[PDB]
């Protein structure tokens, strides 16, 4: 059984963090600049990016899968100019998880017109569990989980076939 | 025909390329399994068609 | 620590991630500390995560 499920309203979480603006051009859709539809890059709300914290509880009765990602800037100045901390860090924890993430200010060679990069991460938290994040920036906070119930386990088919 | 259980499996494992000890672990798998059931099948088929031909 | 004896030595040891930076103040009185374990064939060293965990 697999449900999308809105995690974090958009519109009412997040009334510190600017959720408008953060597309780019390395994900375009219909010419102008876009970017995905179930995580939100944060950016700073009038160069100023206060402490961000938030938690959810699973009071589901099937086990929710939940991704982030840690964005690592090109340079300090995009660093600067996106979040406003020279140092940043995020903490992800779970009541089997815990991790803690530092951005990584380098510049990568170009590839798809970009020097950054974005580490996607995944988690699955069982009912009556809590999942919290903390962040003070070069965070892509998640907008969607996802609602399963794990199968047997099968696995994946690469084919051109069409599907009858 | 009947003899052949089964069971729900999924053959084929994607692995990284870091984690290529593993994929060859899964390739000598899989080759020892192609190789019992081949050598094990035409046997098989060999000897009831000849005791099939006696009786 | 020296293995004088003739069989494998099995080590346990531990790393405290305080929940909040006052109670890393209060419990070693350092707010920034490192650990380092070192032998012939092992050489890590572990920094403290200071996060509010469920």
Same mark, same amino acid.
């Given at each position: 059984?697999?449900?999308?499920?809105?995690?974090?309203?958009?519109?009412?979480?997040?009334?510190?963090?600017?959720?408008?603006?953060?597309?780019?051009?390395?994900?375009?859709?219909?010419?102008?600049?876009?970017?995905?539809?179930?995580?939100?890059?944060?950016?700073?709300?009038?160069?100023?990016?206060?402490?961000?914290?938030?938690?959810?509880?699973?009071?589901?009765?099937?086990?929710?899968?939940?991704?982030?990602?840690?964005?690592?800037?090109?340079?300090?100045?995009?660093?600067?100019?996106?979040?406003?901390?020279?140092?940043?860090?995020?903490?992800?924890?779970?009541?089997?998880?815990?991790?803690?993430?530092?951005?990584?200010?380098?510049?990568?060679?170009?590839?798809?017109?970009?020097?950054?990069?974005?580490?996607?991460?995944?988690?699955?938290?069982?009912?009556?569990?809590?999942?919290?994040?903390?962040?003070?920036?070069?965070?892509?906070?998640?907008?969607?989980?996802?609602?399963?119930?794990?199968?047997?386990?099968?696995?994946?088919?690469?084919?051109?076939?069409?599907?009858? | 025909?009947? !003899?052949?259980?089964?069971? &729900?499996?999924?053959?084929?494992?994607?692995?990284?390329? #870091?984690?290529?000890?593993? $994929? +060859?672990?899964?390739? !000598?798998?899989?080759?020892? &399994?192609?190789?019992?059931?081949?050598?094990?099948?035409? #046997?098989?088929?060999?000897? $009831? +068609?000849?005791?099939?031909?006696?009786?």
């Amino acid at each position: 059984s697999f449900e999308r499920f809105e995690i974090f309203p958009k519109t009412s979480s997040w009334p510190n963090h600017d959720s408008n603006k953060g597309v780019t051009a390395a994900c375009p859709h219909a010419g102008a600049k876009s970017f995905y539809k179930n995580l939100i890059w944060l950016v700073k709300k009038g160069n100023s990016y206060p402490k961000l914290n938030q938690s959810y509880i699973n009071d589901k009765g099937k086990e929710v899968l939940v991704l982030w990602g840690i964005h690592h800037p090109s340079t300090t100045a995009d660093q600067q100019s996106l979040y406003q901390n020279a140092d940043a860090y995020v903490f992800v924890g779970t009541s089997r998880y815990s991790k803690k993430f530092k951005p990584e200010i380098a510049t990568r060679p170009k590839v798809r017109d970009q020097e950054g990069r974005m580490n996607y991460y995944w988690t699955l938290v069982e009912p009556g569990d809590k999942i919290t994040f903390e962040a003070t920036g070069n965070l892509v906070v998640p907008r969607y989980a996802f609602t399963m119930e794990r199968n047997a386990g099968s696995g994946i088919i690469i084919s051109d076939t069409p599907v009858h | 025909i009947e !003899k052949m259980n089964t069971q &729900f499996t999924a053959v084929g494992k994607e692995f990284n390329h #870091l984690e290529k000890r593993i $994929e +060859n672990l899964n390739k !000598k798998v899989d080759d020892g &399994f192609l190789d019992i059931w081949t050598y094990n099948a035409e #046997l098989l088929v060999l000897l $009831e +068609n000849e005791r099939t031909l006696d009786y």
